[PDB]
RNA sequence: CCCCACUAUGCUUAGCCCUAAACCUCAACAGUUAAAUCAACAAAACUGCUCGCCAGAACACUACGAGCCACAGCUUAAAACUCAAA
Ligand code: FES
Ligand SMILES: [K+]
């Protein structure tokens with residue numbers, strides 16, 4: 001004797017109720033573990049609905065201040081002929097090296113954007129970095 | 136007919152890890168053959184039917 | 185020079201010639217390919233008639249006036265009368281989608297004429313007379 | 322009537338190949354819609370019928386273009402089985 | 408002073424790369440089926456590239472290669488669908504082999 | 508709170524929208540050379556936007572310019588003026604052999 | 605039904621006539637996408653508010669009355685007899 005109404009409550013609620021009603025003579029092996037360490041959400045069937053009108057998902061695009069510097073760097077100098085190595089968790093691309101220098105010079109008090117971008121390229125050229133302008 | 140003896144013990148636990156496929160012997164064979172093909176890569180007619 | 189499917193434009197200086205004659209001077213074979221007949225008239229560049237042949241003038245009648253072999257026969261007949269008058273190269277201007285549209289051109293070639301260009305002048309009204317109602321068959 | 326002649330719908334013959342010249346002319350008139358336009362103009366299409374066909378054609382093109390796009394997208398995985406035996 | 412997830416995500420190479428279109432990345436061949444090379448390049452999905460005609464035998468399991476990325480995941484929504492169809496693979500062009 | 512959290516802003520990597528070849532340019536009915544690039548050489552038929560690649564706005568401007576130029580005495584109707592056959596081919600249509 | 609010829613008519617002008625499967629077969633306005641998504645199909649499901657309209661079938665786009673440049677017309681629109689379905 002039991003219940004296969006998987007869309008009515010949860011396996012816990014259905015099992016708990018039938019144990020109270022005496023329908024289940026013994027509790028299942030998992031019941032005491034679920035009770036002691038329950039999930040964050042009780043697993044209850046729900047029907048996913050489609051959004052209409054002015055309803056929008058709450059997920060937000062992930063952006064950072066440095067993304068503005070990256071967009072300009074890719075436009076001006078393009079993607080570096082050096083290849084990304086996404087297996088190394090500490091990999092630094094020419095763009096990231098550019099962003100770090102750009103951040104340092106901003107903290108030194110410079111506030112202009114067009115001037116803070118030209119001085120950064122010079123610093124890297126002095127350090128031996130290859131910056132071939134796309135156009 | 137050599138129907139395999141009960142495929143679980145007294146505690147009810149099936150003996151073979153692929154019991155719940157319903158075809159444990161067939162899938163145990165496919166698993167063994169698929170595994171051999173993997174190891175070869177790591178390392179690297181008329182008579183019968 | 186590479187071949188151009190575009191005809192030479194009158195007034196420009198082209199190098200193409202046919203028996204020493206320019207494109208503007210080549211006689212014209214006017215083929216009217218109707219649904220029930222095919223009419224062919226060969227005229228000079230000055231619009232002087234040189235030869236006329238149709239399926240009806242070649243002894244075909246009624247449902248026979250509108251076939252491929254009837255138009256081919258009309259083309260041969262017009263080519264013969266045109267060749268006697270000194271025609272070798274012709275410009276083909278065909279109007280209509282009848283059965284003798286292409287066959288009438290073959291007959292002109294089998295009759296001894298050389299086609300240097302093909303022009304379609306099938307009348308297409310740009311908005312014009314209302315056509316008759318669909319046939320209930 | 323008032324235009325210059327031997328410019329519109331005019332194809333020159335190459336090396337006496339009149340069959341290829343006629344096919345080129347027929348292909349031009351087909352792509353420009355003339356061949357099918359002459360045929361539809363033999364008898365009067367009633368305005369309600371023209372709108373019905375123009376709407377059916379428009380929707381069959383959209384449906385065929387969308388079905389081709391789907392088949393192309395799902396044909397990337399037509400490669401051999403990478404996990405044969407599993 | 409335990410690093411947070413927000414910090415890992417900000418400073419990850421995949422985050423720093425920005426858009427993936429026309430980005431050169433280093434991949435590794437992990438599975439081969441005939442002339443189909445399955446290449447992992449650090450993303451969610453592998454890409455599948457055909458063995459190049461020149462130096463085809465140089466491309467083996469473990470060989471590191473240069474790729475030009477086009478899409479991290481090939482997905483498209485087709486008419487009358489509530490979600491997107493995904494082929495569960497990245498789109499990339501195999502350029503050659505990476506050597507030191 | 509935390510400095511490494513994402514910040515709200517507009518996509519910095521967003522690419523500009525596409526533009527037709529005639530975006531930002533005046534289409535005059537007297538510029539028959541430009542208009543001739545969008546009509547059929549053999550029949551003078553105006554090309555649809557699927558051939559010209561123009562946007563809805565410029566497809567309409569070109570169409571209206573052609574119709575005005577034709578009936579005002581600047582442009583032929585039944586064929587492309589042969590003077591303009593050697594202009595840049597900007598239309599996605601292949602005709603000959 | 606097919607072919608030929610030809611007329612009212614399709615056009616213009618000045619008056620009428622006032623109909624349509626005049627149909628997105630979806631009343632106007634405002635709002636919502638969370639609840640149960642929802643008889644079915646069509647075209648995801650609803651809320652507030654207002655006007656119009658409906659109350660078995662058939663008789664009936666009918667009869668009578670009334671109004672109308674309408675006169676073999678239009679609009680509004682019954683009842684009796686009949687049925688257990690429609
Ligand atoms: S895209 Fe701007 S006018 Fe065409
Ligand atoms: K309707």
Ligand SMILES: [Mg+2]
Pocket residue numbers: none
């Ligand atoms: Mg009359």
Ligand SMILES: [Mg+2]
Pocket residue numbers: none
């Ligand atoms: Mg009129």
Ligand SMILES: [Mg+2]
Pocket residue numbers: none
């Ligand atoms: Mg209507």
Ligand SMILES: [Mg+2]
Pocket residue numbers: 631632655
């Ligand atoms: Mg109302």
Ligand SMILES: [Mg+2]
Pocket residue numbers: 642
């Ligand atoms: Mg339902």
Ligand SMILES: [Mg+2]
Pocket residue numbers: none
């Ligand atoms: Mg009733």
Ligand SMILES: [Mg+2]
Pocket residue numbers: 665
């Ligand atoms: Mg009525």
Ligand SMILES: [Mg+2]
Pocket residue numbers: none
């Ligand atoms: Mg009445």
Ligand SMILES: [Mg+2]
Pocket residue numbers: none
């Ligand atoms: Mg009355």
